[PDB]
Amino acid sequence: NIFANKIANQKAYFKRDIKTVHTFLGRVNYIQRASKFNDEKRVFRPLQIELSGTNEIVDIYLEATTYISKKALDEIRQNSYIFLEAKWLPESNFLNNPLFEIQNIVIEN
Amino acid sequence: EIKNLDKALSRPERPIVAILGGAKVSDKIGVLNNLLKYVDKIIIGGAMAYTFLAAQGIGIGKSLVEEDKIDLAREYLKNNLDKFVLPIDYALAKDFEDVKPFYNLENTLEIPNGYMGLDIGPKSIEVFKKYIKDAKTILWNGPLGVTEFKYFKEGTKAIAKAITEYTVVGGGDSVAIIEELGLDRRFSHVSTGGGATLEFLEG
Amino acid sequence: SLIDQAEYEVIDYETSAILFLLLKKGFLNFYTEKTEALKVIIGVIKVFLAKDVLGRKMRAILVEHGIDSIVWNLYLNHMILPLLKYHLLSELQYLATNREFIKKFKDIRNDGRILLAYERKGYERGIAYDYK
Amino acid sequence: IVKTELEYVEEDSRLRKEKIELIQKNYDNLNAKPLVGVDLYESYSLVLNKSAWNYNEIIQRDTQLTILDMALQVHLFLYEGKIIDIAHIQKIIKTFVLNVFAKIIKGVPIVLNPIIIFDSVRFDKSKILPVAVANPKLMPPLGVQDWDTIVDEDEEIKKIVSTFIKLLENALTVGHEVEFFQDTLLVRNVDGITSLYVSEKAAQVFNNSVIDQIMPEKPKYEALEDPFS
Amino acid sequence: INQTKEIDVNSKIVKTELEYVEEDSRLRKEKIELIQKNYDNLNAKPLVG
Amino acid sequence: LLVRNVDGITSLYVSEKAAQVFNNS
Amino acid sequence: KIISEEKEILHLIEQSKRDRDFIDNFSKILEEKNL
Hints:
This is part of a larger assembly, with 1 copy of chain A, 1 copy of chain B, 1 copy of chain C, 3 copies of chain D and 1 copy of chain G.
Chain A: H1 4-7, E1 11-14, E2 22-31, E3 43-51, E4 57-64, H2 67-73, E5 81-88, E6 99-108
Parallel strand pairs in A: 4-6
Antiparallel strand pairs in A: 1-6, 2-3, 2-5, 3-4, 5-6
Chain B: H1 2-10, E1 16-21, H2 25-33, E2 41-45, H3 47-55, H4 70-79, E3 84-85, E4 90-93, E5 116-120, H5 122-132, E6 137-140, H6 154-164, E7 168-169, H7 174-181, E8 189-190, H8 195-202
Parallel strand pairs in B: 1-2, 1-6, 2-3, 7-8
Antiparallel strand pairs in B: 4-5
Helix pairs in contact in B: 2-3, 2-8, 3-4, 5-6, 6-7
Chain G: H1 5-21, E1 31-32
């Protein structure tokens, strides 16, 4: 099985609170390093996702604030396949691409 | 023969269903290659269907599959997702003999190791009938199962009976079984050749 | 300078030991009170010992057995020092002209070509071989 | 001195752009020149000159992995609870490369991987040159042998050599420059093309060996020496 | 009236900082891709051809 | 001359004059 | 019309920053799932 070894590498993170989320499901074509902007307290990660079923390229940004959120964000590499649920953040009004916060995510590498 | 194929292809009436029955990935490769951007729905049934299932990560066990093309098969599944239909209910067989079929009460999509994927289950044909219930064109280019054994020859006959209740069939073995069934009149056009008709329909 | 530490900051046991050995071997002489230098070193060592395929085995060896001076010198010279040198030269400008830094890191192998590609692939800032 | 929040943002941006310029300057400070090559196996002298120049340039870049490095990587990779001696692994690796050397000077290619095949080029008597080639498509190599043939049947030695081959392949894939014989260098160029750059000392050992059967000395257990002393 | 109005500092800081982060990341990714292609072009020719 | 080595790989080694006669044909 | 849209966006940004920095409901912190 090609996907047999991918099961042992699953990493799942979730929140027990339920908000309105944007669901992304696909491969990570390109992911950059992390930037610290709000007084070196947050983490900014630009993501390029090739979705599933349409194979279109979308660009998003991810924000991390806690230690566990940064740990979950650090698991995303190139060619990683993700089922990510992201809460929209109101800072996208000053951004070219939307800024999101990880609510639930499942990561396989 | 030319008029019916030209009407079905150049003047198609959507929605359109193209069930290509084949036990070889290469066998219908060209036919499918002709319907990736020229069809609304494509159905894969046969040994190449189990090749596609192998490309899906679902264990095939004793069921054969064209390994040398498996990656290409997966690529097809990557290119078109809604445009592909695969069976979900599998009736396994102890061997290649004419023994009674074996089904799975729970998780029938999974083939146990040691058995061979033999027949299409009632759930898959029920889904096929439910989908084909709204379809102006129902093509065909090959058999939907093995007919050398009676216990596993019911799939194509059931599919033909459901479809008859346009209806164009041009399979090498499907046409003969349809004629032996007695529903030839209901079909809009039953071609006299299987390989030639599929090659003409490819382009 | 090694004493200071942020709140809720966990520094691993092997990272501390490696920092001590670097201090005792004179690989911190260039320091002139630039906290980001030690932050970079600590982060690089932590990621290398936690996520790298060979760094994880190195960490297991350090945890279980007691190595001697010669084996530790080989470990430092052939894996740790090239990674530290590349990740320090690409963040601290003044390290280019720091006489002590050249005096200590002149013979260390350059590994920019591989660590670049690792960065461009989204890898963390300490992977040197691959993820286990 | 003290700064305003806007000045803090400006300082952050200045540091980021400084780091970008440092990225460029790190490549610039590595005084490197593109590797040069020829198009045909025309003359022994020209190919030897190009190979020696390439080897010298890569050596002065100081980006290559020696045999000690690969031995240490194997030592780390094979750890499962028990420590394997670094000197033992280095001795075994040197013995394996010497076996390859002895086998390829007799016109027998050795295949270590579907990608890299070690061969020899003879232009005249007393003039031979080691090469690394890909698997040909229409002209099968003459008497090609696997590496497994020239390795002792003991499980430990076979595991060590298998691990060394796997790590060497990975290092070549990522873009390293691995040393295989003494004073020679193995590089992977564009695409899946592998090349072997031979120093002058190695060309000499290869010619003495092909001339009067003066083989390199038997590998011996060498104690680890301090790089910092 | 003229002397009263003045340039705010909160929204300006937020917007400026966000645009700086986006420009920095775009510039870094461009520089990384050019640097890597330079490394590839430095060691990409056959020895014998 | 045709030989089968250790890996059961057979090869045909051609002299100079044999290749000359091949090329003439 | 009393509050401009730009100021409302700034208030939303500040409130989101406050909600991220200080969390009152513990069901809003990411949890790693055992596997």
